[PDB]
Design an enzyme around this catalytic site. Structure first.
Site, PDB file in Angstrom:
ATOM      1  N   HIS A   1       0.798  -1.215   0.000  1.00 19.20           N
ATOM      2  CA  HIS A   1       0.000   0.000   0.000  1.00 19.20           C
ATOM      3  C   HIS A   1       0.836   1.273   0.000  1.00 19.20           C
TER       4      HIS A   1
ATOM      5  N   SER B   1      -0.218  -1.101  -6.616  1.00 20.75           N
ATOM      6  CA  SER B   1       0.054  -2.276  -7.422  1.00 20.75           C
ATOM      7  C   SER B   1       0.493  -1.907  -8.830  1.00 20.75           C
TER       8      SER B   1
ATOM      9  N   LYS C   1     -15.323  -8.061  -8.011  1.00 21.97           N
ATOM     10  CA  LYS C   1     -14.349  -8.775  -8.833  1.00 21.97           C
ATOM     11  C   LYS C   1     -13.616  -9.837  -8.024  1.00 21.97           C
ATOM     12  N   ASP C   2     -13.336  -9.555  -6.751  1.00 19.67           N
ATOM     13  CA  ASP C   2     -12.779 -10.581  -5.881  1.00 19.67           C
ATOM     14  C   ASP C   2     -13.821 -11.628  -5.515  1.00 19.67           C
TER      15      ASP C   2
ATOM     16  N   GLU D   1       3.523 -34.661   0.158  1.00 15.94           N
ATOM     17  CA  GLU D   1       2.412 -34.070  -0.567  1.00 15.94           C
ATOM     18  C   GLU D   1       2.917 -33.398  -1.843  1.00 15.94           C
TER      19      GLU D   1
HETATM   20  C1  HEC Z   1       7.115 -14.851  -3.224  1.00 16.46           C
HETATM   21  C2  HEC Z   1       6.189 -13.918  -3.450  1.00 16.46           C
HETATM   22  C3  HEC Z   1       4.823 -13.780  -2.734  1.00 16.46           C
HETATM   23  C4  HEC Z   1       4.133 -14.609  -1.925  1.00 16.46           C
HETATM   24  C5  HEC Z   1       4.416 -16.044  -1.432  1.00 16.46           C
HETATM   25  C6  HEC Z   1       2.919 -13.945  -1.537  1.00 16.46           C
HETATM   26  N1  HEC Z   1       2.896 -12.699  -2.113  1.00 16.46           N
HETATM   27 FE1  HEC Z   1       1.240 -11.542  -2.290  1.00 16.46          FE
HETATM   28  N2  HEC Z   1       2.241 -10.280  -3.536  1.00 16.46           N
HETATM   29  C7  HEC Z   1       3.551 -10.432  -3.937  1.00 16.46           C
HETATM   30  C8  HEC Z   1       3.874  -9.332  -4.811  1.00 16.46           C
HETATM   31  C9  HEC Z   1       5.235  -9.097  -5.498  1.00 16.46           C
HETATM   32  C10 HEC Z   1       2.797  -8.558  -4.920  1.00 16.46           C
HETATM   33  C11 HEC Z   1       2.692  -7.274  -5.762  1.00 16.46           C
HETATM   34  C12 HEC Z   1       2.136  -7.650  -7.128  1.00 16.46           C
HETATM   35  C13 HEC Z   1       1.952  -6.444  -8.005  1.00 16.46           C
HETATM   36  O1  HEC Z   1       1.425  -5.416  -7.521  1.00 16.46           O
HETATM   37  O2  HEC Z   1       2.340  -6.512  -9.194  1.00 16.46           O
HETATM   38  C14 HEC Z   1       1.743  -9.135  -4.122  1.00 16.46           C
HETATM   39  C15 HEC Z   1       0.468  -8.641  -3.965  1.00 16.46           C
HETATM   40  C16 HEC Z   1      -0.430  -9.094  -3.022  1.00 16.46           C
HETATM   41  C17 HEC Z   1      -1.779  -8.622  -2.785  1.00 16.46           C
HETATM   42  C18 HEC Z   1      -2.513  -7.502  -3.543  1.00 16.46           C
HETATM   43  C19 HEC Z   1      -3.448  -8.102  -4.590  1.00 16.46           C
HETATM   44  C20 HEC Z   1      -2.713  -9.000  -5.540  1.00 16.46           C
HETATM   45  O3  HEC Z   1      -2.967 -10.227  -5.529  1.00 16.46           O
HETATM   46  O4  HEC Z   1      -1.880  -8.481  -6.316  1.00 16.46           O
HETATM   47  C21 HEC Z   1      -2.289  -9.334  -1.784  1.00 16.46           C
HETATM   48  C22 HEC Z   1      -3.680  -9.223  -1.141  1.00 16.46           C
HETATM   49  C23 HEC Z   1      -1.309 -10.279  -1.353  1.00 16.46           C
HETATM   50  N3  HEC Z   1      -0.184 -10.113  -2.124  1.00 16.46           N
HETATM   51  C24 HEC Z   1      -1.501 -11.175  -0.338  1.00 16.46           C
HETATM   52  C25 HEC Z   1      -0.752 -12.300  -0.135  1.00 16.46           C
HETATM   53  C26 HEC Z   1      -1.049 -13.338   0.817  1.00 16.46           C
HETATM   54  C27 HEC Z   1      -2.288 -13.266   1.732  1.00 16.46           C
HETATM   55  C28 HEC Z   1      -0.082 -14.268   0.714  1.00 16.46           C
HETATM   56  C29 HEC Z   1       0.164 -15.607   1.456  1.00 16.46           C
HETATM   57  C30 HEC Z   1      -0.585 -16.169   2.407  1.00 16.46           C
HETATM   58  C31 HEC Z   1       0.834 -13.817  -0.307  1.00 16.46           C
HETATM   59  N4  HEC Z   1       0.400 -12.616  -0.808  1.00 16.46           N
HETATM   60  C32 HEC Z   1       1.956 -14.478  -0.723  1.00 16.46           C
HETATM   61  C33 HEC Z   1       4.400 -11.451  -3.575  1.00 16.46           C
HETATM   62  C34 HEC Z   1       4.052 -12.562  -2.845  1.00 16.46           C
HETATM   63  C1  LIG Z   2       8.304 -37.934   2.229  1.00 15.76           C
HETATM   64  O1  LIG Z   2       9.116 -37.103   3.043  1.00 15.76           O
HETATM   65  C2  LIG Z   2       9.041 -35.776   2.874  1.00 15.76           C
HETATM   66  C3  LIG Z   2       8.193 -34.999   3.568  1.00 15.76           C
HETATM   67  O2  LIG Z   2       7.333 -35.483   4.484  1.00 15.76           O
HETATM   68  C4  LIG Z   2       5.983 -35.744   4.096  1.00 15.76           C
HETATM   69  C5  LIG Z   2       8.192 -33.529   3.341  1.00 15.76           C
HETATM   70  O3  LIG Z   2       7.434 -32.815   3.944  1.00 15.76           O
HETATM   71  C6  LIG Z   2       9.126 -32.932   2.359  1.00 15.76           C
HETATM   72  C7  LIG Z   2       9.031 -31.446   2.216  1.00 15.76           C
HETATM   73  C8  LIG Z   2       9.865 -30.726   3.226  1.00 15.76           C
HETATM   74  C9  LIG Z   2      10.836 -29.874   2.928  1.00 15.76           C
HETATM   75  C10 LIG Z   2      11.234 -29.518   1.533  1.00 15.76           C
HETATM   76  C11 LIG Z   2      11.614 -29.197   4.016  1.00 15.76           C
HETATM   77  C12 LIG Z   2      10.710 -28.455   5.007  1.00 15.76           C
HETATM   78  C13 LIG Z   2      11.451 -27.306   5.607  1.00 15.76           C
HETATM   79  C14 LIG Z   2      12.100 -27.270   6.769  1.00 15.76           C
HETATM   80  C15 LIG Z   2      12.825 -26.069   7.300  1.00 15.76           C
HETATM   81  C16 LIG Z   2      12.127 -28.505   7.630  1.00 15.76           C
HETATM   82  C17 LIG Z   2      11.150 -28.447   8.810  1.00 15.76           C
HETATM   83  C18 LIG Z   2      11.883 -28.160  10.081  1.00 15.76           C
HETATM   84  C19 LIG Z   2      11.583 -28.586  11.304  1.00 15.76           C
HETATM   85  C20 LIG Z   2      10.414 -29.464  11.621  1.00 15.76           C
HETATM   86  C21 LIG Z   2      12.453 -28.193  12.465  1.00 15.76           C
HETATM   87  C22 LIG Z   2      11.674 -27.901  13.756  1.00 15.76           C
HETATM   88  C23 LIG Z   2      11.002 -26.568  13.721  1.00 15.76           C
HETATM   89  C24 LIG Z   2       9.712 -26.345  13.940  1.00 15.76           C
HETATM   90  C25 LIG Z   2       8.734 -27.435  14.257  1.00 15.76           C
HETATM   91  C26 LIG Z   2       9.142 -24.954  13.879  1.00 15.76           C
HETATM   92  C27 LIG Z   2      10.191 -23.844  14.033  1.00 15.76           C
HETATM   93  C28 LIG Z   2       9.590 -22.586  14.573  1.00 15.76           C
HETATM   94  C29 LIG Z   2       9.611 -21.372  14.017  1.00 15.76           C
HETATM   95  C30 LIG Z   2      10.264 -21.056  12.704  1.00 15.76           C
HETATM   96  C31 LIG Z   2       8.961 -20.195  14.690  1.00 15.76           C
HETATM   97  C32 LIG Z   2       9.959 -33.702   1.662  1.00 15.76           C
HETATM   98  C33 LIG Z   2      10.925 -33.164   0.665  1.00 15.76           C
HETATM   99  C34 LIG Z   2       9.972 -35.174   1.884  1.00 15.76           C
HETATM  100  O4  LIG Z   2      10.736 -35.890   1.278  1.00 15.76           O
HETATM  101  C1  LIG Z   3      -4.353  -4.928  -6.296  1.00 11.27           C
HETATM  102  O1  LIG Z   3      -5.541  -4.542  -5.620  1.00 11.27           O
HETATM  103  C2  LIG Z   3      -5.831  -5.244  -4.520  1.00 11.27           C
HETATM  104  C3  LIG Z   3      -6.459  -6.427  -4.556  1.00 11.27           C
HETATM  105  O2  LIG Z   3      -6.819  -7.019  -5.708  1.00 11.27           O
HETATM  106  C4  LIG Z   3      -8.057  -6.625  -6.292  1.00 11.27           C
HETATM  107  C5  LIG Z   3      -6.757  -7.166  -3.300  1.00 11.27           C
HETATM  108  O3  LIG Z   3      -7.317  -8.233  -3.411  1.00 11.27           O
HETATM  109  C6  LIG Z   3      -6.374  -6.549  -1.989  1.00 11.27           C
HETATM  110  C7  LIG Z   3      -6.628  -7.228  -0.666  1.00 11.27           C
HETATM  111  C8  LIG Z   3      -7.898  -7.962  -0.397  1.00 11.27           C
HETATM  112  C9  LIG Z   3      -8.409  -8.089   0.823  1.00 11.27           C
HETATM  113  C10 LIG Z   3      -7.791  -7.488   2.049  1.00 11.27           C
HETATM  114  C11 LIG Z   3      -9.675  -8.867   1.026  1.00 11.27           C
HETATM  115  C12 LIG Z   3      -9.380 -10.375   1.022  1.00 11.27           C
HETATM  116  C13 LIG Z   3      -9.438 -10.969   2.390  1.00 11.27           C
HETATM  117  C14 LIG Z   3      -8.453 -11.230   3.251  1.00 11.27           C
HETATM  118  C15 LIG Z   3      -6.995 -10.963   3.017  1.00 11.27           C
HETATM  119  C16 LIG Z   3      -8.801 -11.843   4.577  1.00 11.27           C
HETATM  120  C17 LIG Z   3      -9.937 -12.866   4.453  1.00 11.27           C
HETATM  121  C18 LIG Z   3     -10.898 -12.751   5.593  1.00 11.27           C
HETATM  122  C19 LIG Z   3     -12.186 -13.093   5.590  1.00 11.27           C
HETATM  123  C20 LIG Z   3     -12.909 -13.668   4.406  1.00 11.27           C
HETATM  124  C21 LIG Z   3     -13.024 -12.914   6.826  1.00 11.27           C
HETATM  125  C22 LIG Z   3     -12.232 -13.085   8.132  1.00 11.27           C
HETATM  126  C23 LIG Z   3     -13.137 -12.893   9.308  1.00 11.27           C
HETATM  127  C24 LIG Z   3     -12.824 -12.691  10.589  1.00 11.27           C
HETATM  128  C25 LIG Z   3     -13.848 -12.510  11.671  1.00 11.27           C
HETATM  129  C26 LIG Z   3     -11.380 -12.644  11.021  1.00 11.27           C
HETATM  130  C27 LIG Z   3     -10.972 -11.362  11.768  1.00 11.27           C
HETATM  131  C28 LIG Z   3     -10.750 -11.614  13.229  1.00 11.27           C
HETATM  132  C29 LIG Z   3     -11.101 -10.841  14.262  1.00 11.27           C
HETATM  133  C30 LIG Z   3     -11.804  -9.533  14.039  1.00 11.27           C
HETATM  134  C31 LIG Z   3     -10.844 -11.161  15.704  1.00 11.27           C
HETATM  135  C32 LIG Z   3      -5.745  -5.370  -1.978  1.00 11.27           C
HETATM  136  C33 LIG Z   3      -5.315  -4.677  -0.733  1.00 11.27           C
HETATM  137  C34 LIG Z   3      -5.443  -4.644  -3.228  1.00 11.27           C
HETATM  138  O4  LIG Z   3      -4.885  -3.568  -3.203  1.00 11.27           O
END
Ligand code: HEC
Ligand SMILES: COC1=C(OC)C(=O)C(C/C=C(\C)CC/C=C(/C)CC/C=C(\C)CC/C=C(\C)CCC=C(C)C)=C(C)C1=O
Ligand SMILES: COC1=C(OC)C(=O)C(C/C=C(\C)CC/C=C(\C)CC/C=C(\C)CC/C=C(/C)CCC=C(C)C)=C(C)C1=O
Ligand SMILES: CCCCCCCCCCCCCCCCCC(=O)OC[C@H](COP(=O)([O-])OCC(O)COP(=O)([O-])OC[C@@H](COC(=O)CCCCCCCCCCCCCCCCC)OC(=O)CCCCCCCCCCCCCCCCC)OC(=O)CCCCCCCCCCCCCCCCC
Ligand SMILES: CCCCCCCCCCCCCCCCCC(=O)OC[C@H](COP(=O)([O-])OCC(O)COP(=O)([O-])OC[C@@H](COC(=O)CCCCCCCCCCCCCCCCC)OC(=O)CCCCCCCCCCCCCCCCC)OC(=O)CCCCCCCCCCCCCCCCC
Ligand SMILES: CCCCCCCCCCCCCCCCCC(=O)OC[C@H](COP(=O)(O)O)OC(=O)CCCCCCCCCCCCCCCCC
Ligand code: HEC
Ligand code: HEC
Ligand code: HEC
Ligand code: HEC
Ligand SMILES: COC1=C(OC)C(=O)C(C/C=C(\C)CC/C=C(/C)CC/C=C(\C)CC/C=C(\C)CCC=C(C)C)=C(C)C1=O
Ligand SMILES: COC1=C(OC)C(=O)C(C/C=C(\C)CC/C=C(/C)CC/C=C(\C)CC/C=C(\C)CCC=C(C)C)=C(C)C1=O
Lengths: 122, 70, 48, 376, 59, 68, 243, 376
Positions: free
Chosen positions: H201, H205, H227-228, H271
């Site tokens: 923000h 975008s 649209k979303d 997976e």
């Molecule tokens: C490795 C890259 C990557 C990951 C993973 C990623 N984002 Fe994005 N995201 C981006 C980038 C870069 C943009 C900006 C895109 C643009 O404006 O061209 C973006 C844009 C967005 C936007 C604005 C709308 C859109 O889709 O462009 C939202 C919302 C968003 N990200 C949410 C998320 C959420 C929620 C997750 C995961 C739970 C996530 N992103 C994971 C890179 C990432």
């Molecule tokens: C059949 O076999 C296999 C799996 O199994 C079903 C797999 O999934 C994966 C996929 C896993 C990959 C690629 C690696 C995942 C990444 C990391 C860093 C390993 C996970 C690390 C752990 C569990 C260390 C302990 C840490 C924990 C629990 C959390 C740490 C806390 C914070 C960061 C706040 C592969 C390749 C695999 O061949």
């Molecule tokens: C490029 O333009 C853009 C878009 O593309 C058109 C986008 O999409 C978005 C972002 C879209 C948003 C924030 C809406 C999508 C929803 C999200 C990330 C969260 C989903 C939550 C839901 C459905 C409800 C959750 C409900 C509750 C009660 C949880 C909250 C908890 C408490 C209050 C305790 C942005 C900012 C944008 O700029």
């Protein structure tokens, strides 16, 4: 109620004078006045009354508040020669504030609002 | 950021040009007495009300236990 | 202050209070809450 | 200049380093940082304890014991969690009493007070469902007694009670859902705390003088970091004493017996921080009226920024009545730990009536009289 | 009045990369001294009651 | 001190009993006054508890003096 | 009600009560021997293992020899059957009954509770335990006891199902200590107090170190607080306002 | 304005109602809102799941079965939580590929890309340790194979491995700590998502044309809500199909067998969303070199805003090379589910080499050539 409310006013005046004596003794050590205890953030009429004032009165009020806050940080009071000169009941705001509140009461009887709001930041 | 009209002269000394904790021993009894002078009435009325009501309640509870005896 | 200070300062007048038509139209939302609760729970023998 | 190039540096600098703060704040303004530190401590020690606790009625008590004896540093973590809950409630209660004394909820800080009351309600629910997790006698029977208050609601009381229990009695599904809710609610507390703190930064803090302080402001990070460190170390001393020297001082011995649904204890009491609410409930011989009285207490807490007049030192009549209110709430705390008795019932009724009188009669009316005395 | 020496300032205080390892060695020795004092006081007070006293008594 | 294979606690408890003659008199008065009871609910447990609390408070530090 | 509450127990001068004091580890050893010969016929202590007695109460070899004298059910073998074996260090203390119901059946309906946490599980723990064990007194006037029950004014309600079990000379200590009933009761109370809080000595040593460190750090932090606030606490403000 | 008087309404209005957005965004800009919806769905389903799951060996499999057959709506909750991880990874992968296609991480949106890569790493760890929780054969053996890969770091190997396991093999302590870590990590995901959206923000975008769009901006809350909603309804259709008609299509049948540490399955594969990293690891005949290559992929992902030149259309050579990169990644995804064979080893080595070649050679050098062709 009117039979007992004729003489309920001197008792109010006596309690008010005792209250102002005690609080003004508390206020004079910080160099404050009774009108300095009113916050423009706490009341929008006080904020309106404060911008109706000449600049030197506002400068003096800010100076007194700064001195009191410095004294509060230092855990001190005013020295005896300054403390004997303090006038906690010398009003600078009550006339303007009374006029502001009377205007707001007048506008409300005709359904009009006050021509100002609260202080909003950000 | 909230312009404040004010006229003053401010002086400040370096914190490496004065002492840090040496005056804390001199002012400690005076600050103790000043604290109790300022908060004496509130602490006393709190103590009187709490301990008096607690003592009356505990006394009457003991009398209630004694009344159940044979 | 805005709650009871406004009543004590004389700022709450009949001319500043909301109208009876406004109170009727605002208070009509009470039936919406009742029918929303009846839609959510469906605790009736009303369908017959 | 470097914090002008990244957003996250700019927000942190503005709200932690260069934030203006009144220069005359005393040590009564340390309760918020201490409450935040105690929330962080509770979250850390709880996350660490969750790696050894099992939320099943056949393994909960046994896993608690195994964590106590066999897990390295497990006794420190378990005692730290159980006594950090009590220190969390001490710090929060003192914070609220500071706000009540100074009238800090007034305009323009109504949102801060309301989010605070929301935080306190979430805190109460979090601690109550966390206490059920050891599955001792107090853990079982307090959950039985308190969740049986839902039957005071007519028609749909027993249905809500059975829906919350997952059955006809407090049993394993209750413990499992309580564990999930208990893991979840601290993160809502962290979010609520972030919102609560960001609401205060709109206008700043009040000062012990009760006057406007915009002429005398200093940076938060350079000055109040050390002042908060001093209070954090005083809290760490009390925490160390409670963890290492008196670990079961603020607990109950009956929670070391495993839960038995066929033999109740003689004196079912909660933790100390729920005793005033329990005294309010026990003083009234009607369950619906007791629940209503608790709800009215919390409604009066919500309505404080709009009915409350009267603040700190210079408003002396309400300042004197504050100490009577404090004595009343501590008498309510003491009365909750005692058994039902005609004199304790009478004294609890009078104490509840005085709490309502102070909240709803003294704060508007006496505040208005002292405003008329001082500025009329 | 009392003032830190200049030659001792130029060695252990002017750079953080020299100050930090000195800090760590001072922390190590402070922890060792506190451990020694606490353990000596505890063992002196409770002499004859510990398990090691019974084991050394049975030799 | 010499530790004895016999139990010192009954002797110490008998020694402290002249220090609590008032509570013993109150208990014996209670025991005489409920002698003609027929409902089966009259008992003197409270005065008994008073007497034994006095004796226990006397004899508590003198019991552990005789034990290893 | 007073009779339902029971008689309160006096405060005895235990040698481990102060925060500077350790356990008496010779009394823990003698208390375990009272447990094996008198208590364990009807009490389980299911959260204790022989491994935890090492370095507190016995050496490794003594605890191994004690554990090897117990029969522990193990299995299943390669034929899918249950067998018995010698106990080892990782094994828990033997339970006299397989389940709660046979324990109730052997004792007139009353279940003798587990003693691992009975010291911290009662109000005024060690004092109540000692006064209960040495306190089987004559009942007062108007109090009758049914068959299978025995009077004890420290038990709440006054009618306990546990009979007098400590007798003079009923345990032969290996350190020459004469075993009266009071000495046996004091030793088993010490062992049970250790069982409720097995790490009390280590906790107290850590608490002493923590209190010392935090007390020094409070002074150092007060010093660094006052150093930072010194240009503000000593500032000079001169203005034209006199009032 | 009503939103100008409460600071909560001002922020919500500014960032969700009146936020200026380019008007020519197509349906490939709906990845982020779908990813947020999937994160919220996973959090809700899991919090509901944790009220019936027991995180202990000899109870975990039976608790999942009791959840499936006895809890009302429990089968829907479990299948939704299982397939929601797959749909979450589908959406996040398509989001990343969009950013790769358009050069979305370039100046001034490098913080957005970096926070995205951090979010992806936390998502991977969360999904893996959540896959361990049902305690089947695939769960146990995947956790065994992956966590016993710390014996590639010299000297400090099995020490870290045994500290992770809480023992000498994957057992009850590993499952018990994996439950706590898996419950906790999605809240870090939600906070990182909030920070990630807040970083975008600052500058807004990009658009499909790849030009400056400050002249043609429209309100978010009216035009991009429906649209979303359209894309959310498509995602709900796919989600409902996966839950109700093919609930075990994306899984593995071996995870319905209770875990046996003494018998291993014939084929141990993770997976599907972990398969490309698994193919990269399994193709290289050295454990330390495989871990180094896996780390190098993510390092090159972090370095992409500072080395990657070239965006969408009007940069046609890199646009064409994107499809070879997409084919390479999909080939690595296919190869991870096969057996180890000399031809598959050779093909996986070639695919890994081309992945590094595209990420580190094509994106800077071909992009610089495109800039020299277009504006040179
Ligand atoms: C490795 C890259 C990557 C990951 C993973 C990623 N984002 Fe994005 N995201 C981006 C980038 C870069 C943009 C900006 C895109 C643009 O404006 O061209 C973006 C844009 C967005 C936007 C604005 C709308 C859109 O889709 O462009 C939202 C919302 C968003 N990200 C949410 C998320 C959420 C929620 C997750 C995961 C739970 C996530 N992103 C994971 C890179 C990432
Ligand atoms: C059949 O076999 C296999 C799996 O199994 C079903 C797999 O999934 C994966 C996929 C896993 C990959 C690629 C690696 C995942 C990444 C990391 C860093 C390993 C996970 C690390 C752990 C569990 C260390 C302990 C840490 C924990 C629990 C959390 C740490 C806390 C914070 C960061 C706040 C592969 C390749 C695999 O061949
Ligand atoms: C490029 O333009 C853009 C878009 O593309 C058109 C986008 O999409 C978005 C972002 C879209 C948003 C924030 C809406 C999508 C929803 C999200 C990330 C969260 C989903 C939550 C839901 C459905 C409800 C959750 C409900 C509750 C009660 C949880 C909250 C908890 C408490 C209050 C305790 C942005 C900012 C944008 O700029
Ligand atoms: C508890 C949390 C409050 C700690 C306050 C941080 C601090 O100033 O360090 C004191 C203190 C350091 O001790 P010190 O040597 O007396 O202080 C350094 C100098 O006096 C003076 O050092 P300085 O003036 O350079 O300190 C500025 C401070 C930056 O200070 C800030 O911006 C504070 C921001 C957070 C405030 C927290 C309040 C709650 O940055 C640091 O040097 C410490 C960064 C760690 C935070 O912090 C600690 O490390 C103590 C433990 C706290 C954890
Ligand atoms: C003992 C008896 C207990 C009952 C009386 C309590 C204390 C008596 C005085 C009360 C009082 O006003 O306290 C502040 C009082 C003086 O206050 P003030 O100067 O008027 O105003 C400063 C503010 O009030 C304070 O603001 P500040 O931030 O500028 O000062 C911070 C610091 C002041 O800094 C200090 O000087 C304290 C030093 C701590 C000692 C730790 C030593 C261990 C390690 C040493 C390392 C130090 C490094 C320095 C080395 C370089 C030296 C050249 O104060 C403290 O945090 C220490 C505790 C103060 C009272 C807390 C307890 C109140 C409730 C009572 C509960 C008791 C029941 O300071 C002290 O209590 C420290 C002096 C010791 C008094 C002993 C008797 C002297 C004759
Ligand atoms: C029968 C059962 C016997 C039980 C015996 C033990 C009971 C509790 C222990 C004794 C408590 C009594 C002294 C407590 C002193 C505490 C300190 C204190 O008060 O200082 C705070 C406070 C300190 O002020 P500061 O130093 O300014 O904070 O002191 C005061 O202000 C004085 C308080 C006096 C008010 C309480 C007097 C005692 C109440 C007894 C009422 C009896 C009613 C009888 C009605 C029926 C008659 C038939
Ligand atoms: C008051 C606020 C409070 C907060 C915040 C809190 N807990 Fe606790 N928690 C308690 C209480 C009270 C208990 C009961 C302790 C006892 O009596 O044994 C408890 C016990 C537990 C237990 C059972 C283990 C035991 O010792 O009984 C677990 C597991 C747990 N908490 C996890 C957490 C987690 C995870 C978090 C945060 C992410 C958390 N808690 C935060 C109050 C809290
Ligand atoms: C019911 C009231 C209430 C509760 C509960 C409450 N707050 Fe406060 N808090 C306030 C008020 C009002 C203020 C403003 C007081 C002032 O600045 O004079 C405040 C101020 C603060 C401050 C700034 C400095 C200070 O200590 O006054 C912090 C930090 C803070 N709160 C954090 C917290 C945290 C963290 C929690 C709980 C987890 C919490 N608060 C609970 C009402 C509350
Ligand atoms: C004759 C079998 C038996 C023996 C041997 C025995 N107990 Fe008891 N014990 C019981 C029974 C039965 C109860 C429960 C009685 C009741 O609850 O009414 C009990 C209760 C207890 C209690 C708890 C009392 C309470 O208030 O909850 C303790 C402590 C105790 N025993 C300790 C011991 C000790 C120490 C010994 C060895 C001197 C011992 N037991 C030997 C049968 C026995
Ligand atoms: C990025 C993916 C992801 C997120 C986010 C996620 N989970 Fe899951 N979780 C999984 C996967 C995959 C499984 C394995 C499901 C299976 O195969 O049965 C799982 C399993 C579980 C299980 C074990 C029960 C079962 O049916 O497997 C619980 C409990 C659980 N998750 C809770 C949560 C909670 C609580 C949250 C959030 C607060 C959460 N999950 C968020 C991926 C995720
Ligand atoms: C003048 O007034 C003020 C104060 O008073 C003197 C203050 O003190 C502060 C500073 C505030 C503090 C120290 C309170 C702490 C703040 C909050 C919001 C408490 C809740 C936060 C928690 C529990 C964080 C823990 C969670 C984490 C890290 C997320 C999980 C992730 C991982 C474990 C990796 C400020 C800004 C202030 O203006
Ligand atoms: C030993 O034991 C005992 C406790 O314990 C420590 C107690 O506290 C109390 C008494 C406490 C009172 C009166 C204050 C706290 C009161 C309530 C009602 C706590 C709130 C908890 C409820 C209603 C349980 C339901 C849980 C929910 C709804 C989970 C939250 C989730 C969502 C809202 C989605 C007693 C008597 C007790 O003897």
């Amino acid at each position: 109620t009117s039979l007992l409310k004729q003489v309920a006013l001197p008792v109010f005046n006596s309690l008010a004078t005792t209250y102002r004596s005690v609080v003004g003794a508390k206020l004079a050590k910080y160099g404050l006045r009774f009108d300095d205890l009113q916050d423009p953030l706490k009341d929008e009429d006080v904020a309106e009354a404060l911008r109706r004032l000449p600049p030197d009165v506002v400068v003096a009020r800010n100076c007194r508040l700064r001195r009191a806050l410095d004294l509060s940080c230092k855990h001190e009071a005013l020295p005896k020669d300054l403390l004997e000169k303090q006038t906690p009941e010398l009003s600078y705001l009550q006339d303007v504030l009374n006029e502001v509140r009377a205007e707001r009461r007048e506008r409300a009887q005709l359904g009009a609002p006050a021509p100002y709001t609260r202080i909003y930041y950000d | 950021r909230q312009n404040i009209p004010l006229r003053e002269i401010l002086y400040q000394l370096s914190p490496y040009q004065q002492d840090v904790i040496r005056q804390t021993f001199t002012n400690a009894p005076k600050t103790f007495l000043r604290f109790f002078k300022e908060k004496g009435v509130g602490l006393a009325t709190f103590g009187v009300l709490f301990f008096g009501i607690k003592g009356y309640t505990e006394h009457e509870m003991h009398q209630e236990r004694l009344a159940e005896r044979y | 202050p805005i709650g009871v200070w406004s009543v004590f300062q004389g700022y709450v007048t009949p001319a500043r209070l909301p109208s009876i038509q406004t109170l009727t139209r605002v208070g009509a939302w009470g039936g919406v809450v009742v029918v929303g609760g009846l839609y959510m729970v469906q605790p009736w023998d009303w369908l017959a | 200049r470097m914090h002008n190039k990244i957003q996250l540096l700019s927000v942190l600098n503005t709200h932690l380093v260069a934030y203006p703060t009144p220069m005359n704040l005393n040590y009564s303004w340390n309760g918020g940082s201490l409450a935040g530190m105690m929330l962080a401590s509770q979250m850390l020690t709880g996350i660490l304890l969750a790696m050894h606790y099992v939320g099943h009625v056949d393994y909960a008590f046994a896993s608690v014991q195994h964590l106590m004896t066999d897990v390295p540093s497990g006794m420190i973590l378990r005692y730290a969690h159980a006594n950090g809950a009590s220190l969390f409630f001490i710090v929060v209660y003192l914070h609220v009493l500071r706000g009540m004394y100074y009238g800090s909820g007034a305009q323009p800080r109504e949102i801060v007070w309301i989010s605070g009351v929301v935080i306190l309600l979430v805190m109460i629910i979090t601690a109550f469902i966390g206490y059920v997790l050891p599955w001792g006698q107090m853990s079982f029977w307090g959950a039985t007694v308190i969740t049986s208050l839902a039957t005071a609601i007519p028609v749909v009381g027993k249905h809500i009670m059975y829906w919350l229990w997952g059955g006809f009695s407090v049993d394993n599904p209750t413990l499992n859902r309580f564990y999930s809710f208990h893991y979840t609610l601290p993160f809502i507390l962290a979010g609520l705390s972030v919102f609560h703190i960001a609401a205060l930064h709109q206008y700043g803090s009040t000062n012990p003088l009760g006057v406007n302080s915009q002429s005398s402001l200093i940076s938060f990070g350079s000055y109040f970091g050390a002042k908060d460190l001093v209070g954090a170390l005083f809290l760490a001393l009390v925490f160390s004493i409670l963890v290492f020297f008196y670990p079961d001082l603020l607990g109950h011995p009956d929670n070391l017996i495993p839960a038995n649904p066929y033999s109740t204890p003689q004196h079912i009491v909660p933790e100390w921080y729920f005793l005033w609410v329990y005294a309010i409930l026990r003083s009234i011989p009607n369950k619906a009226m007791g629940v209503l009285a608790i709800g009215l207490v919390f409604a009066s807490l919500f309505a404080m920024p709009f009915i409350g007049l009267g603040g700190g030192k210079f408003r002396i009549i309400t300042e004197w009545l504050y100490w009577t209110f404090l004595a009343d709430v501590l008498l309510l705390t003491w009365l909750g730990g005692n058994e039902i008795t005609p004199i304790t019932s009478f004294v609890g009724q009078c104490c509840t009536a005085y709490l309502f009188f102070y909240l709803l009669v003294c704060q508007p009316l006496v505040g208005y009289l002292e405003t008329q005395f001082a500025h009329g | 009045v009392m003032r830190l020496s200049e030659a001792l300032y130029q060695t252990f205080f002017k750079r953080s990369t020299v100050y930090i390892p000195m800090l760590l060695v001072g922390a190590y020795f402070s922890n060792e001294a506190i451990d020694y004092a606490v353990d000596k006081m505890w063992t002196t007070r409770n002499k004859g009651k510990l398990f090691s006293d019974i084991i050394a008594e049975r030799t | 001190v010499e530790y004895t294979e016999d139990d010192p606690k009954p002797q110490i408890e008998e020694d402290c009993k002249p220090h609590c003659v008032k509570e013993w008199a109150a208990y014996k008065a209670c025991a005489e006054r409920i002698k003609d009871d027929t409902t089966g609910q009259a008992h003197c447990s409270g005065q008994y508890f008073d007497f034994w609390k006095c004796v226990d408070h006397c004899a508590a530090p003198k019991i552990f003096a005789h034990l290893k | 009600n007073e009779a339902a509450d029971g008689l309160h127990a006096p405060h005895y001068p235990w040698g481990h009560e102060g925060v500077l004091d350790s356990y008496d580890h010779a009394a823990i050893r003698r208390g375990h021997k009272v447990y094996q010969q008198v208590c364990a016929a009807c009490h389980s202590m299911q959260y204790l293992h022989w491994r935890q007695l090492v370095g507190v109460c016995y050496t490794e070899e003594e605890a191994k020899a004690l554990a090897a004298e117990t029969e522990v059910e193990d299995g299943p073998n390669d034929e899918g059957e249950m067998f018995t074996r010698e106990g080892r260090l990782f094994d828990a203390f033997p339970s006299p009954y397989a389940n709660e119901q046979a324990a109730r059946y052997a004792n007139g309906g009353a279940y003798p509770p587990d003693l691992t946490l009975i010291s911290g599980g009662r109000h005024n723990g060690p004092n109540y335990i000692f006064s209960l064990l040495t306190g089987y007194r004559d009942p007062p006037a108007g109090i009758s006891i049914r068959e299978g029950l025995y009077y004890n004014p420290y038990f709440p309600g006054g009618a306990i199902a546990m009979p007098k079990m400590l007798v003079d000379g009923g345990v032969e200590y290996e350190d020459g200590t004469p075993a009266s009933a009071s000495q046996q009761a004091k030793d088993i109370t010490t062992f049970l107090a250790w069982a409720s809080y097995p790490y009390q000595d280590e906790m107290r040593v850590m608490g002493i170190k923590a209190c010392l460190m935090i007390s020094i750090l409070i002074g150092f932090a007060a010093y660094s607080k006052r150093l930072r606030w010194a240009p503000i606490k000593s500032q000079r403000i001169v203005m034209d306002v006199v009032n």
